[PDB]
């Protein structure tokens, strides 16, 4: 009493639990209660994760206030101390857990049948205590209360199949959701539910982390469960059940992996964004502990708002540097919000649909989307059209022989200085959900490859991917393309043709998957275009690198009176007001462009005979025209079968932008037009 | 009643269902299941399948039954047994082993056969389910998938030596020399704390005799995942497989295998001093079946695994190294080999989706067939591996031809030239993370032994990296003398290299050697140097454009856009049969034609070394092996000479100067 | 800064044959003697 003194805190957990139960049972504003609908789904085993919205709790409290009832601030209590309310809400859900309307069959998970077995076993042991005491003949309330004193049942955490998470309350619908930098998360925020805004830099493999290790004793037939809380644990050697503890001949008990409780465990590393780091500082990282069904929701390169419980961990640094009870910290992730939704996770829900129709019905989708790509960049409309086609990409074809065709458009922008090639690269990086901006001859030599290291979390050798690997199923914007090393150039060649990187080096023999669309920006030989010199002469690209690019723009800066007047009005308007000059044309928001492009990428248009015949004729005419000029000062490198597949890819991308399933003549017309005007700036 | 705790498995019901499945299954059930009812032939798909298998295993004395898991889906009564086996492999496989023993005993007794029942009863029969559901890769398995029957597919990189796993511990008394033999129980052996003899009860008298215990074989194999689905941004993964007591040494490095086994997790002790385990479990696979034969892949070269094949017979592992060729399949192979257009049929069957390149696909086919391997009784070795270089104008499908020969070959590694190193292509020293030791791992040229190594961008790889390929392309070996490794390693791998000339275009002004830009010592090692040129011909464009645009008419193309092409399933089996069973022998007329032609070629410009005669012979042998001929006539030598001449385009090359006459090119 | 991990058990299966000398068998037999002993049709020890 004198030691371990008691303190008077304003938190009463009994009525807080009562409020939690009332909210779970009665809240229905989002036909019946939302949360019992969710628990009914969980009981029937269609759902294994319970997400408790703090907006729902806040709305429930507001409604209780409006009707006059005084309700405790459950939202603030959860935000201040979130670890206890996961525990509380789990107990409350267990109390109000509906019976399953679907019977256990052979297609259910082994965990589900194990939980059903132990639930039935504990109810049977309750009934067996009851029958035995009734036979002993010594009110049913007292009989029951004796039974739960003399039963060793499976605790509710062992008969539990769902995972509980706390979704932060929205800023518009409002502490736990305002984004914090890694620096702004001090020790005052420890123990609270907080949201950190950052970029993920390293994700470990999903490993089974034991939470309650189970053992079976062959002597008494008991199952002894030992909870695990730390990095390491000491296994039990002798049984600790009632029978063996009371007896003198103890039983030696063996592990039961199938009966143990495991958690899907990941240890991600979030990092400060460049806009969050102070002046002259290096960004610092934070450890995120992802558990349960939330795993595989974070990947390196993701810019995310991660909401979780900021919790302390035992010290792991040097012992001589420990001054007091120093503790490491991590973020027990509860919710993940992706700034750039991936194209693979696209679903045609109602709101996604309404937005897409409001984009289509406005008309001129192709030109609106192209002109909306970097709208302060002015007068590069064919450039923006080609970039939009690169974002959409063609249709990947796997022939039955096992052959694969790339399906992705590589675009090279060779141009004069000050033409916005680098500004167009960052625009594409911003638009793309998986976009990697690199500069040649910087530090990307290992970037255009993967490096083998050791995972600190899990004792394995894993090769972490670089620029060409992190931008997988995305876009790699390579600036200063003409200034890379030979190894990097060969890697780019392999990526642009086979979409793989074959590495055979000391310690590694692998074929990395790099399904990357390459957007290169280059400067012409001598840094400025010499129209006196041949185009191929001024292009410092091997006929084989040039061949790989589906489109090669020649962005030349020729002086003029009207064109320069119009660029200067645009740039000066952008400098006054942080927006583009045109009032008739409104740019598409980059989030709504990503949603349209995600929708468009789900279509796989095919080519009919009537369109592919023209495609063949155009290819023949292109080949003849290329043959007629091999060195006529306008030679772009003669046409190749790669130009046919680039024409095909551009036509398929244009068909996808129309949300069509037929590759029409208009799309092939526009593809040929884009290829032709890729090179008219020379004239 | 009486199901097993923690499982849905009931011993009686599962045994009855599996016995009914074994006694009453016909392959027409699976043919109906796979929606292939029009392939159903009454002769072999209407016999009890597993009754015949049990009879064959009884006659042959084997102990392992290879159960196709998908077969359980065909039978109605075992639709649940499939899920039980996948979910609970341990209990279900034990019940299946018992049921196999009962089934064979019933087959012997009920049919009143002569076979002795003593050696059947004392034999341990095992079941090897392989074709379980193939999905989820390896990294997408959650902790709920622990102790489940999973199916991985990948490449074998390394294998530890045979580890002894103690099954019976033999103790001995330090006083009275009395011995008990304790049995292992879930990895724990109960050491006696007292001599069980009533005469002496000394407490710590008993000592473990390590060399008199009973041990079993355990082996850990390092595998690289090659999943069907690869999520964006991830890199290739490596896992550890555990093979036990008959599957040890059944997988060699460089093997592409599909392995079915139990997904297990073990706690790893943090330190060797104290007994404290790590809360983060380590995952691995207990191998129960290994499949080394793919129906869309050539069989492994039996000339390289003869010792391994006969060691497999002593080991009674019953691992199918080479696919089975039935009598009907052999008759079909002979009928196809009797065709008049066999050469052009096999050539156009190679990569059907690549446009017409008849000589490139005819050289590729001959390389796949290979020459004749001649071992000297007095000491020596000639290997029929054919090395082919594809130098040519950019965009000619050279890389698609390397990607097909990589996919179709049994073993081989696809390299990119600049991404390869001299150490990388040979054996190197790495560090294991499990044992924390230094181990040897094979290179690309060693993992490709017995197959084809595909090297793209052969020009971009440096001079010193190219030095290691000399010994491989000539002696088919790598004689390595480095710190920790001094030995000769077999590297009997054909080399399929691809390259473009300097300037990335074949300039007709420069001679052939200037364009290829390879040292005479390496350009001689190539048995076939192809100059693939992109000429502008209107009909060539017309037809290459129809070919490419026909692949886009349907979302997943079924390519039959030829007169007739053999399926890869038939093509690989034909090539494997010809390689295994046909060994052409040079005849005297072939010898005279060979000498004639070599002297004719032996008369700047590309040189003709003595190695060209050796490319002739083996090429001729390859042709003689293609037609299933056991002898080489002068027609095969003439075909080899014609292929050699047409590959380098001698018909358009001036003898005095190595210019290619662009008007003389025969693209067609 | 974490709490104390708990250890708990639950009966699932019949273990090894109850042996007569086991403290838990002895306790069970004493409990049966207390609850079931009758003297002149009276549970003397239960009532006491």
């Amino acid at each position: 009493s004198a030691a371990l003194p008691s303190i008077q805190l304003p938190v009463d957990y009994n009525n807080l639990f009562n409020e939690i139960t009332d909210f779970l049972v009665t809240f229905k504003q989002d036909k019946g209660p939302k949360y019992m609908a969710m628990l009914q789904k969980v009981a029937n085993r269609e759902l294994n994760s319970v997400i408790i919205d703090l907006d729902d709790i806040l709305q429930y409290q507001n409604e209780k206030f409006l009707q006059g009832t005084q309700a405790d601030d459950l939202v603030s209590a959860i935000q201040q101390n979130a670890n206890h309310f996961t525990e509380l809400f789990c107990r409350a859900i267990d109390n109000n857990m509906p019976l399953p309307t679907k019977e256990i069959d052979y297609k259910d998970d082994v965990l589900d049948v194990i939980l059903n077995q132990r639930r039935l076993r504990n109810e049977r042991m309750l009934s067996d205590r009851t029958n035995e005491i009734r036979s002993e003949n010594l009110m049913n309330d007292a009989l029951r209360e004796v039974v739960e004193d003399e039963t060793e049942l499976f605790p509710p955490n062992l008969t539990r199949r769902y995972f509980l998470y706390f979704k932060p309350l929205s800023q518009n619908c409002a502490i736990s959701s305002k984004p914090l930098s890694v620096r702004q998360i001090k020790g005052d925020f420890l123990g609270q539910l907080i949201t950190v805004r950052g970029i993920i830099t390293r994700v470990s493999d999903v490993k089974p982390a034991v939470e309650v290790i189970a053992y079976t004793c062959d002597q008494c037939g008991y199952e002894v469960f030992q909870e695990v809380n730390s990095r390491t644990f000491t296994p039990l050697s002798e049984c600790t059940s009632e029978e063996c503890s009371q007896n003198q001949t103890k039983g030696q008990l063996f592990m039961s992996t199938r009966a143990s409780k495991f958690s899907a465990f990941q240890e991600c590393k979030i990092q400060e964004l460049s806009q969050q780091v102070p002046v002259g500082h290096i960004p610092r990282s934070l450890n995120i502990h992802v558990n349960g069904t939330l795993v595989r929701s974070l990947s390196p390169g993701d810019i995310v708002d991660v909401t979780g419980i900021f919790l302390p961990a035992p010290y792991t640094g040097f012992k001589a540097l420990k001054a007091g009870l120093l503790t490491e910290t991590y973020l027990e992730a509860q919710f993940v919000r992706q700034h750039k939704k991936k194209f693979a996770s696209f679903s045609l829900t109602s709101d996604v649909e309404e937005r897409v129709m409001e984009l289509i019905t406005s008309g001129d989708v192709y030109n609106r989307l192209a002109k909306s790509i970097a709208p302060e960049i002015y007068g590069n409309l064919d450039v923006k059209k080609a970039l939009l086609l690169l974002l959409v990409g063609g249709v990947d074809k796997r022939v039955g022989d096992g052959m694969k065709i790339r399906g992705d458009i590589n675009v090279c922008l060779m141009g004069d200085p000050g033409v916005a090639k680098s500004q167009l690269l960052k625009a594409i990086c911003k638009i793309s959900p998986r976009g990697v901006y690199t500069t040649g001859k910087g530090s990307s030599g290992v970037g255009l490859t993967a490096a083998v290291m050791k995972d600190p979390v899990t004792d394995e050798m894993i090769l972490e991917g670089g620029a060409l690997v992190l931008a997988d199923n995305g876009i790699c914007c390579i600036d200063e393309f003409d200034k890379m090393d030979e190894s990097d150039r060969t890697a780019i060649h392999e990526v642009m043709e086979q979409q793989t990187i074959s590495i055979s080096k000391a310690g590694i023999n692998t074929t990395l998957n790099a399904r990357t669309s390459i957007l290169a920006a280059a400067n012409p030989l001598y840094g400025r275009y010499n129209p006196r010199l041949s185009p191929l002469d001024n292009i410092n690209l091997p006929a084989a690198l040039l061949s790989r690019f589906d489109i090669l723009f020649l962005m030349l800066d020729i002086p003029s009176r009207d064109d320069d007047e119009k660029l200067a009005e645009h740039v000066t308007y952008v400098h006054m007001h942080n927006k583009q000059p045109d009032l008739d044309f409104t740019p598409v928001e980059p989030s709504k462009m990503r949603e349209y492009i995600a929708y468009a990428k789900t279509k796989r248009p095919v080519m009919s005979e009537a369109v592919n015949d023209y495609v063949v004729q155009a290819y023949i005419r292109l080949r003849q025209d290329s043959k007629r000029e091999m060195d006529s000062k306008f030679s772009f490198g003669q046409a190749t079968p790669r130009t046919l597949l680039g024409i095909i890819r551009l036509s398929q991308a244009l068909a996808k932008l129309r949300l069509a399933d037929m590759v029409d003549i208009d799309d092939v017309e526009e593809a040929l037009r884009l290829v032709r005007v890729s090179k008219e700036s020379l004239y | 009643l009486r199901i097993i705790w923690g499982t849905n498995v009931s011993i009686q019901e599962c045994t009855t269902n599996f016995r009914n499945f074994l006694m009453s299954f016909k392959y027409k059930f699976r043919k109906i299941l796979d929606e292939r009812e029009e392939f159903i032939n009454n002769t072999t798909d209407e016999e009890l399948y597993y009754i015949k298998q049990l009879n064959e295993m009884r006659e042959l004395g084997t102990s392992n039954l290879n159960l196709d898991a998908r077969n359980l889906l065909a039978y109605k009564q075992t639709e649940d047994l499939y899920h039980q086996l996948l979910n609970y492999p341990q209990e279900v496989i034990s019940i299946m082993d018992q049921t196999i023993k009962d089934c064979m005993v019933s087959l012997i007794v009920d049919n009143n056969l002569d076979y002795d029942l003593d050696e059947i009863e004392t034999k341990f029969y095992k079941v090897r389910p392989y074709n379980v559901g193939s999905c989820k890769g390896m990294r997408e398995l959650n902790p709920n998938d622990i102790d489940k029957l999973i199916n991985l597919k990948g490449l074998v990189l390394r294998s530890t030596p045979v580890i002894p796993d103690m099954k019976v511990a033999f103790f001995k008394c330090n006083v009275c020399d009395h011995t008990m033999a304790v049995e292992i129980d879930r990895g724990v052996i109960q050491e006696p704390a007292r001599c069980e003899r009533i005469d002496c009860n000394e407490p710590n008298s008993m000592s473990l005799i390590h060399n008199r215990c009973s041990f079993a074989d355990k082996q850990v194999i390092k595998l690289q995942e090659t999943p069907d689905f690869v999520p964006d941004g991830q890199t290739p993964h490596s896992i550890s497989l555990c093979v036990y007591d008959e599957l040890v040494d059944s997988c060699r490095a460089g093997d592409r295998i599909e392995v079915t086994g139990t997904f297990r997790s073990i706690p790893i002790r943090a330190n060797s001093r104290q007994r404290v385990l790590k809360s983060l479990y380590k995952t691995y696979v207990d191998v129960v079946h290994v499949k080394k034969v793919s129906d869309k892949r050539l069989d492994v070269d039996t000339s390289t695994i003869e010792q391994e094949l006969m060691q497999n017979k002593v080991d009674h592992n019953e691992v199918e190294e080479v696919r089975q060729i039935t009598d009907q399949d052999l008759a079909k192979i002979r009928e196809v080999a009797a065709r008049e257009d066999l050469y052009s049929l096999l050539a156009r069957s190679i990569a059907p989706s690549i446009y017409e390149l008849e000589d490139v696909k005819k050289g590729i086919l001959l390389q796949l067939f290979g020459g004749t391997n001649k071992t000297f009784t007095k000491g020596g070795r000639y290997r029929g591996d054919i090395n082919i270089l594809l130098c040519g104008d950019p965009s000619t499908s050279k890389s698609q031809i390397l990607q097909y020969v990589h996919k179709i070959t049994p073993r081989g590694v696809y390299t990119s030239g600049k991404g390869s190193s001299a150490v990388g292509l040979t054996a190197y020293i790495t560090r294991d993370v499990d044992t924390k030791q230094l181990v040897l791992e094979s290179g690309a040229l060693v993992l490709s032994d017995g197959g084809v190594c595909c090297i793209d961008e052969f020009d971009k790889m440096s001079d010193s990296t190219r030095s290691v390929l000399h010994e491989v392309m000539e002696q088919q070996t790598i004689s390595i003398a480095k710190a920790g490794i001094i030995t000769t390693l077999n590297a009997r791998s054909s080399i399929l290299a691809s390259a473009n000339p300097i300037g990335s275009r074949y300039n007709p002004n420069l001679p052939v050697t200037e364009n290829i830009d390879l040292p005479p010592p390496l350009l001689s090692r190539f048995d076939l140097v192809y100059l693939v040129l992109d000429k502008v011909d209107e009909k060539n464009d017309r037809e290459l454009a129809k070919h490419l645009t026909n692949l886009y008419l349907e979302d997943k193309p079924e390519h039959i856009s030829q007169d007739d092409v053999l399926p890869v399933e038939f093509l690989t089996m034909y090539i494997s049969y010809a390689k295994e069973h046909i060994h052409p022998i040079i005849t005297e007329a072939a010898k005279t034609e060979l000498v004639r032609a070599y002297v004719g070629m032996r008369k700047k410009r590309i040189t003709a070394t003595t190695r060209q005669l050796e490319s002739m012979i083996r090429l001729a042998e390859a042709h003689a092996k293609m037609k299933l001929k056991n002898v080489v006539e002068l027609e095969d030598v003439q075909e080899a000479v014609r292929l050699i001449r047409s590959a380098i385009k001698d018909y358009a090359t001036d003898p005095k100067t190595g210019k290619i006459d662009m008007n003389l090119v025969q693209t067609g | 800064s974490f709490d104390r991990p708990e250890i708990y058990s639950a009966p699932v299966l019949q273990g090894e044959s109850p042996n007569d000398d086991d403290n838990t068998e002895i306790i069970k037999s004493f409990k049966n003697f207390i609850l079931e002993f009758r003297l002149d049709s009276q549970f003397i020890y239960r009532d006491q």
Partner: peptide, 30 residues
Amino acid sequence: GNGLGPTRASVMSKNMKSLSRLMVDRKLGV
């Protein structure tokens, strides 16, 4: 029931005998 029975082997494997200890009634599971 019918009057006949399948011909079962006499030798029981150690694993099959070990599985006999883990049996529970079908009221649990299926």
